[PDB]
Amino acid sequence: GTLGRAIYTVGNWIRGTGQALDRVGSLLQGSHRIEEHLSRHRTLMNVFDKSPLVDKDVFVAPSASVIGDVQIGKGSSIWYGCVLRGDVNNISVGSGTNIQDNTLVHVAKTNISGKVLPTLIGDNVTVGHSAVIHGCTVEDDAFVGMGATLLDGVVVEKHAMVAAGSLVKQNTRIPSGEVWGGNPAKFMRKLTDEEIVYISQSAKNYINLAQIHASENSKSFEQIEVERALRKKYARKDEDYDSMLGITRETPPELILPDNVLPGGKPV
Amino acid sequence: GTLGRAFYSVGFWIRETGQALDRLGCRLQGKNYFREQLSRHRTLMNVFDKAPIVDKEAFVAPSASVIGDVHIGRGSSIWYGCVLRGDVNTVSVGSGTNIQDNSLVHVAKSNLSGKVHPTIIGDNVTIGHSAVLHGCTVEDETFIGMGATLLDGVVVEKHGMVAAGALVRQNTRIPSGEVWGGNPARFLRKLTDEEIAFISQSATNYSNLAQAHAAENAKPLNVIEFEKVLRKK
């Protein structure tokens, strides 16, 4: 009513005074600080004339920049800080894959060696923690080492785990079941059955791991207020007072992680 | 100067008091949007009088984090995710070079283990992806490998290709027009003429692609997405 209008007016006066005082304070600094702008980053954007073909079931991190003509399959996800810089040739990404944090996948400009082929990514394959992909042609059911630098012409087949930190050189093809690693190609060991099962289990598990990140990074601000209020409200419990009041404080359904991301299943 | 620092701190005090007054007025009116979790990132972070200088035609990525007093020339590209950072000393970037994706330039932020060496970047210098050039001076017309790990005291003279994944050690000089790779870096071979020509064309091609990105990078921010994210259910 009238009191509400008066309080709105005095709030507007206070806001204007605060803006003027903030401007004066910034002026006193000598304009040596760069003021913050809203957002110049786009999570995925066209390069010349074509937009990426991202599937509906894909988790793309807002930090990640999947630019240009990049095709992403079902269930596959892009993690934080990962750059899919595809500007000259398509980047076909399989289904259920995961290009992990700080990872780069880039395509040569069709003439790095003369017969350049586009960077093709298989399905059910993992890249792993900021690896380097430049013209690679990874197929299904493979593991790439952490920080690996698979260069142009590298054709890694199925069950072709690459040791972390490897530097596979130009036009190198690894047979299935090898653990080639080190700064050179430098074959180390053979992929055992249990290690293959471990690779498959990791590839399958990160698929259901990405769903919580998808449902969290996409939350609206109004949902975030409720989420923070609930999280702070139920941070700690007290059996004494709750029992005395005859009530039990259960965690809200919005505060329940799915059982598939637990350390192995702890419903209780 | 100390006199400038006092004014800068008083500016902090007055600015935060003004923002607190604005928050009190806004909250008193019955609206809470200051509580938002907007990513408070700037691509041109500055400290005291160390504000960065970027040429008008230079391309800087939105995700690029240029911190300090980095000088950037005309036509040189500042690509996605690069962490150009000069605080204890300046970072010199020439004209027409290309700091590629997921790179970073150190100045040895600490003080121990000797003085800090500024980083010089020449013209038409091709910097590979995942570069961690660490207080090393590199002049024009050279190539840096894919994932090289150059340390301080490294002077790479003209046409000095570096192999991918090299671990060039401290106080190591790379002679003209030759590759230097391995762990640790070891001499591989001599650079041929066609590779020098490839070096020459690569900088121009990457720069042209950089302005191709930059022309459409300053576009209006597609207000339809902004309207969509507001009405999210």
């Binding site: 009513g1 009191l3 509400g4 209008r5 309080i7 709105y8 709030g11 | 008193l28 009116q29 019955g30």
Partner: peptide, 30 residues
């Protein structure tokens, strides 16, 4: 965007203003 619409918080704000004015008057009148 003209009225606060929260008739409960408004009473708190006016009470705080009255408290500040009363404290000032107490300091001056006494």
């Amino acid at each position: 965007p003209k009225v606060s619409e929260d008739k409960n918080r408004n009473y708190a704000v006016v009470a705080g203003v009255v408290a500040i004015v009363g404290s000032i008057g107490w300091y001056l009148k006494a």
